[PDB]
Amino acid sequence: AGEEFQHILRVLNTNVDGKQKIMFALTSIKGVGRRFSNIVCKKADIDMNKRAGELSAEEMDRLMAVVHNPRQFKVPDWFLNRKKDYKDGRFSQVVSNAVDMKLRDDLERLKKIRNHRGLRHYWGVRVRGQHTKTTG
């Protein structure tokens, strides 16, 4: 019985639905998919047959550590999503609101570049070589 049960968790400014199951509540963060949500739970060593509003405050602390600090919990280089960045060169796993930035930051580069893929975004038409007669 979850006598203190929480209905929302607010993790990383994302209003995590606590009545979901952990691995499927953490995915609500912009940058955490189902795969990466799973592995975070493993390395933090938290039982999965749990609803996140039943989960304890200390356990959320460990989850947030390994997501802000994945490279120190032996998370292999290939789960991360900013692999071989262009600004610093580091291997980072971007999270909720930093995703919204770096996307434009990539866009901002190519727009200043005069890149085809930049001016393609600038015009709004499809970017990846898909045909554009009668689709979209």
Partner 1 sequence: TVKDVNPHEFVKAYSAHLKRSGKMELPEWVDIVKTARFKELPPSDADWYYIRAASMARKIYLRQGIGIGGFQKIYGGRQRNGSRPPHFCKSSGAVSRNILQELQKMGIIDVDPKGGRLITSQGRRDLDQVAGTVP
Partner 2 sequence: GKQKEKVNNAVLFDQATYDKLLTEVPKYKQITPSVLSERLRINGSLARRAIKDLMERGLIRMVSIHSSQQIFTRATN
List of residues contacting partner 1 (CB under 8 A): 34-35, 38-39, 42, 74, 76, 79
| Position among 6, 8, 20, 73 found at the interface with RNA (CB under 7 A) | 20
Q: Which of 28, 111, 17, 124 is nearest to 67 (CA)?
A: 28
Q: Which is nearer to partner 1, 21 or 102 (CB)?
A: 21
Rounded CA separation 130/119 (Å): 16
Please report, for residues 20, 92, 104, 109, the alpha-carbon distance to residue 99 in angstroms, rounded to integers and kept in the order given: 23, 11, 9, 16
Rounded CA separation 98/95 (Å): 6
Q: How far is the CB of 60 from RNA (least distance, A)?
A: 18
Site map (CB under 7 A) of RNA, residues 90-109, x = contact: ---xx----x--xx--xx--
Q: Tell me which residues touch partner 2 (CB under 8 A).
A: 1-3, 5, 19, 51, 53-54
